[PDB]
Amino acid sequence: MAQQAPDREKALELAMAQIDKNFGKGSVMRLGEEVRQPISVIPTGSISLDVALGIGGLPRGRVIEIYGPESSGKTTVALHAVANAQAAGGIAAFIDAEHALDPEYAKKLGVDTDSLLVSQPDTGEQALEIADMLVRSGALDIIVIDSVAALVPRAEIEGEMGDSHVGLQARLMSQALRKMTGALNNSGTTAIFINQLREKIGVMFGSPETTTGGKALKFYASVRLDVRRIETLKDGTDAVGNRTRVKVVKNKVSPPFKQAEFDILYGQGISREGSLIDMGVEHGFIRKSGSWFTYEGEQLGQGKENARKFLLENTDVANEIEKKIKEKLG
Ligand SMILES: Nc1ncnc2c1ncn2[C@H]1C[C@H](O)[C@@H](COP(=O)(O)OP(=O)(O)OP(=O)(O)O)O1
């Protein structure tokens, strides 16, 4: 009228709404928001991690990337990811390109191997196809491709080509990805890609940042987990496991930048127990000091691991805590 107008807020969310309607949901966010609870999500075995994913676990219907150095967790997470959506009626396909999977490990974590679909492609091209048409059938829910890096095209090798044009791999990805993101979730079949290595504070190396097939996946991924090993879980003797830190650096399904930790015991998986003590204390329900963890009056033991076994063998109480923790969160 000759007036500018609405209180920032009343005009911000007026446009901020416009945005969503034009580019989607996760398009704009206030890191603080609790924002929605879509009734879909694969638990990640770590109450720790999935209360950080903002939706109780990996969002069914989304390409999920889990990069991170070697021997730090990704797949152990992945496998668990499978175990669950599998142990809930789901069928998980696994496109192996690393040729390094130990079923009895996947077994100990609760994966039904015999009913697990494995595939060992020959070209990084074929792989994306058998996994593209394997996901179009809508039978699989969770499909995990091992190594966004070991996906070398027919013209071969990863980091070699030439003349009047150049770049291989990152294209096949670009390709597969578009063509796969579509279908991928009309079916609601969430996908997971293990990617990996070169850091713990900054990406430097040969042909540095971003990566091998990166870019595309780095843009299609609706979630990205930076899984890096932090410390070697001592066990009095040498060591029971490793503690893992996860920095969900990209979350299109809620707020990003959060993070969780948890342990992985050498052959046994992500410790549900240890994970309840941690959560259990960082939210009160479990009291400390004296190095004696105590669940409201009743004690658990003297020293993480001891209270850890207590919870291991005492499921009754354990469930309670997982519980109390559950609604104290979401
Ligand atoms: N078959 C196994 N038996 C016992 N422990 C295992 C086994 N496989 C892996 N681990 C343990 C040892 C390591 O400290 C830890 C690493 O987990 P892992 O799932 O192998 O990480 P990752 O698969 O994400 O990383 P990488 O990139 O090296 O493949 O788990």
324 labelled binding-site residue: no
- Burial class (CB within 10 angstroms; exposed 0-12, middle 13-18, buried 19+) of 199: middle
Neighbours of 329 (CB within 10 A): 12
End-to-end Cα spacing for the chain: 46
Could you tell me if 135 and 92 are in contact, meaning their C-beta atoms sit under 8 angstroms apart?
A: no
**Centroid of ligand 1 to alpha carbon of 206 (angstroms):** 25
User: What's the 172 CA to ligand 1 centre distance in angstroms?
Assistant: 28
Of 297, 273, 275, nearest in space to 287 by CA: 297
CATH fold of the domain at 271-330? Rec A Protein; domain 2 (3.30.250)
- Mutational pocket test of ligand 1: of 72, 113, 195, the residue with most ligand atoms within 8 Å of the beta carbon: 72
What whole-number distance in Å separates Cα of residue 21 and Cα of residue 216?
A: 23
Q: Is 222 annotated as a binding residue?
A: no
Among 132, 61, 68, residue whose Cα is nearest residue 95 = 132
Q: Which residue has the tokens 């075995």?
A: 45
63, 217 contact by CB (below 8 A):
yes
| Angle separating helix axes 304-313 and 315-327, nearest 10 degrees | 100
Using alpha carbons only, what angle is made at residue 171 by residues 165 and 174, rounded to the nearest 5 degrees? 150
The experimental resolution of this structure, in angstroms, equals 3.5
* Way the structure was solved: X-ray
Residue in the structure block whose two tokens are 């109780």: 56
**124 neighbors 172 (Cβ within 8 angstroms):** yes
CATH class of segment(s) 29-270: alpha beta
Residues 260, 231 contacting (CB under 8 angstroms): no
Is 72 marked as a binding-site residue?
A: yes
Whether residue 223 contacts residue 64, with contact meaning beta carbons closer than 8 Å, is answered with yes
| Token couple for 17 | 């709404």
CATH 3.40.50.300 placement within the chain: 29-270
> 330 to each of 53, 124, 323, how far by Cα in Å?
12, 40, 10
244 known member of a binding site = no
Pocket, ligand 1, Cβ cutoff 6 A: 70-76, 102, 105, 196, 242, 264, 266-267
What atom in ligand 1 is closest to the CA of residue 104?
A: 1
Q: Has 164 been labeled as part of a binding site?
A: no
What SS3 string covers the chain? Answer: CCCCCCCHHHHHHHHHHHHHHHHCCCCCCCCCCCCCCCCCCECCCCHHHHCCCCCCCECCCCEEEEECCCCCCHHHHHHHHHHHHHHCCCCCEEEECCCCCCHHHHHHCCCCCCCCEEECCCCHHHHHHHCCHHHHCCCCCCEEEECCCCCCCCCCCCCCCCCCCCCCCCCHHHHHHHHHHHHHCCCCCCEEEECCCCCCCCCCCCCCCCCCCHHHHHHHCCEEEEEEEEEEECCCCCCCEEEEEEEEEEECCCCCCCEEEEEEECCCEECHHHHHHHHHHCCCCCECCCCEEEECCEEEEECHHHHHHHHHHCHHHHHHHHHHHHHCCC
DSSP bridge partners of 192:
64, 144
Q: Which residue's CA is the closest to the ligand 1 atom numbered 3?
A: 267
Residues making up the chain, counted from first to last:
330
Q: Quick one: residue 192, left, alpha or beta (phi over 0 = left, psi -120 to 50 = alpha)?
A: beta
Interior CA angle at 40 toward 58 and 23, to 5°? 80
Burial of 31 (0-12, 13-18, 19+ CB in 10 A): exposed
Closest-lying ligand 1 atom to the alpha carbon of residue 227:
24
Within the chain, which residue ranges are assigned CATH 3.30.250.10?
271-330
What's the CA gap between 233 and 268, in Å, rounded? 14
